[PDB]
């Protein structure tokens, strides 16, 4: 890491991040070890990707914030509005090129695989596919698909396991307006507070985040796992703000976040770190991940073009063919 950069980062003190809570992916062990090992001191305001978008655009010069972590579909919205400012990063030789723009605007730094978190208490009958979700009465908790990467993926996932693919979400809009019509979804995020109430009954979720929301709540409370029909994989990045008012500190943060010991971190979290086959992860982690055979009908987008433009139109088909028909 150059010192240089260190130091520039140190004058400026601190990084003010966008959604990258504690919580999500093992964050909490990252912004520890800037303080730990650099002194550079951080807070950050939770939101979903299109809102930090929209933030950094709105705030310019008086940014709030200098970083921020998007869905794989938003790195070219960022760099569209005009919020992105490139940082390859010394690793940036072994992130793959499907998980990477040209410039270094964007680079996903690990991957997940949409999964269901289910009550024990109330599902009795535990769905293990995206079909048997349309059979029973309880509550979908999908994610809010306007703003939302994971909500946004969680629709994707449900289209796969119908037979579609990322050029034509149709099908998965026909789904949801199913459920919608039962008077069974809910269109929020899951969240470690509404998991510790009860209230998430079946929720759509990243399976990084629904093994990390399960181990704060209760392991015996909630089950964890990839619908066996069909899901998505794919993958964040983050996005270092062209107005950032720490631009050196956000540049340090994301080459850490990309070092071995950043990936590390990820993995402790229950993410699947980009660069997984240049580190030497800890061998208690395997045991924590579910069963191989889950991932069976989990696929990557082939199409990134197709899924960026699919993703961008879905927030108002949502509005328009899932809200409008709530019971
Ligand atoms: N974590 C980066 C933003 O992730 P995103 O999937 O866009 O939003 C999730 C929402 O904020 C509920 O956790």
Known sequence: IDENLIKAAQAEGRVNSLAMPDTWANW???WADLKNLY???????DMSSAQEIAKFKTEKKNASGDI?????????????????????????DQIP????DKDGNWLLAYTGTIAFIVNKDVVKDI?????????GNYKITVGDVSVAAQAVSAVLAANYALGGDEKDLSPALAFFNTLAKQGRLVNND???????????????????????????????????????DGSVISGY????????????????????????????????????PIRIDHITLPDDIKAKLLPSE?????????????????????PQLWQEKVIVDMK
């Open 28 to 30: 909490k062990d990252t």
């Open 127 to 135: 769905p293990k596919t995206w079909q048997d979700l349309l059979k």
């Open 97 to 100: 090129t499907w998980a990477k």
């Open 68 to 92: 921020g972590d998007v869905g794989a579909s938003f790195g070219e919205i960022a760099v569209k509005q005009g919020v992105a400012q490139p940082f390859k990063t010394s690793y940036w």
């Open 190 to 228: 899951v969240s470690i507070a509404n998991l510790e109430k009860g209230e998430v009954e079946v929720g759509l979720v990243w399976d990084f985040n629904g093994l990390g929301y399960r181990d704060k709540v209760g392991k015996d409370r909630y089950e964890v796992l990839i619908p066996a």
């Open 294 to 314: 889950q991932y069976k009908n989990a696929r990557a987008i082939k199409d990134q073009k197709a899924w960026e433009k699919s993703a961008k139109e879905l």
């Open 39 to 45: 002194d550079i001191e951080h807070s950050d305001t």
């Open 237 to 272: 990045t983050t996005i270092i703000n062209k107005y950032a008012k720490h631009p050196n500190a956000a540049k340090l943060a994301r080459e850490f976040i990309l070092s071995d010991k950043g990936q590390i971190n990820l993995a402790k979290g229950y993410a699947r």
